[PDB]
Symmetry: C2
Subunit: 215 residues, 2 copies
């Protein structure tokens, strides 16, 4: 009965969703810790955790790392993160003792700009190429190098994205993607931070609702 | 009679110079091509070639690569090269079919600045730390990863550095360092470029006497 990643990968995206619907109905009833426990018990390959080290990143990092100590933490350095994020990554990595795995584009940001100009200023196709070089290519290489088959991420339905209907389990980039805190609201996030002695990203106090790259 | 790198490495720097003086007197009589030929024949380990892809870089690159096809070419991307240098590297790599090996700091330039500020604006100690992160650490890692025992560089005595008395052969970073065109003047450089259909770095035409990082 254990889900077969290879078989699932052979089905159209639409059909993968139908195949996981039942599993997702049961995962939805568990809490974040139990969802992580279930994945570790029923999902394959190497387990990895990714984070953008944004405003509320401390929650997913602490929660998953507590259950799976030294789990590889994939960070995609675009070369354009806020300086506060870099120091936040350094701080959290040291505090939670994260097995950090930094991945970056094939060449430096200066090299990229020398070749293509400022891609984020070139409409939809530029932004698309930028993400491919700085986020998509590096992450795919990471999953491969780390032999990942199960990937934990800290996405939440209530964040400003097309994530309102995201399930706990899905297949993405050819691997199982697990979202333990997919249903957490801001109150639950705060309570978790308070309880475990964690903090929001430093730019929260400068009024940043979210953080990524800065130009 | 072949020089012993391990034995030489065990001697004080001053004594290494005395041990190579005789070899250097004979190498001085050969031309650049013969100096390269001699090293390939009498020096050990893997052979590597480094270049900063500056104004006259095409000469040493073409000359050594012609004698030793696909020789690893070490480029130390500081993340702050002129955009013209990046395009120059791309162009030369494609034209001469260089076996380019790009090495960079442990983390991105943005990350470095987040941690230490702009090191090149912090006096002698800042510049020293900057070079250690962006030039020294990467090059040492390259020599190691590539298993280098002999290293070719395109230095010339007449350039604006303490290079006026540089010999053809020396020991640096624990390996033999060979400077085939150590005695070439600007006339010889130009004639070589003309003859082989090569060009100066594009910024020469914008009046740059030399190029490195830009801030």
């Amino acid at each position: 009965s254990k889900l077969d990643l290879n078989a699932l990968n052979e089905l159209p995206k639409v059909d993968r969703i139908l195949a996981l619907a039942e599993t997702n109905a049961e995962l939805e009833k568990l809490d974040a810790e139990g969802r992580v426990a279930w994945a570790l018990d029923n999902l394959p390959g190497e387990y990895v955790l990714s984070s953008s080290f944004g405003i509320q990143a401390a929650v997913s990092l602490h929660l998953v790392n507590q259950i799976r100590p030294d789990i590889p933490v994939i960070l995609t350095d675009t070369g354009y993160l806020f300086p506060e994020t870099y120091r936040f990554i350094d701080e959290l990595t040291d505090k939670l003792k994260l097995n950090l795995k930094v991945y970056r584009a094939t060449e430096s940001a200066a090299w990229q700009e020398a070749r293509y100009g400022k891609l984020w200023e070139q409409g939809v196709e530029g932004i698309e190429k930028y993400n491919d070089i700085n986020k998509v290519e590096p992450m795919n290489r990471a999953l491969k190098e780390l032999n990942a088959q199960t990937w934990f991420a800290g996405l939440r339905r209530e964040q400003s994205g097309s994530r309102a209907n995201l399930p706990v389990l899905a297949i993405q980039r050819g691997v199982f993607k697990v979202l333990p805190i997919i249903d957490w609201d801001n109150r639950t996030i705060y309570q978790y931070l308070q309880k475990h002695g964690l903090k929001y990203h430093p730019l929260w106090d400068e009024g940043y609702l979210s953080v990524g790259d800065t130009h």
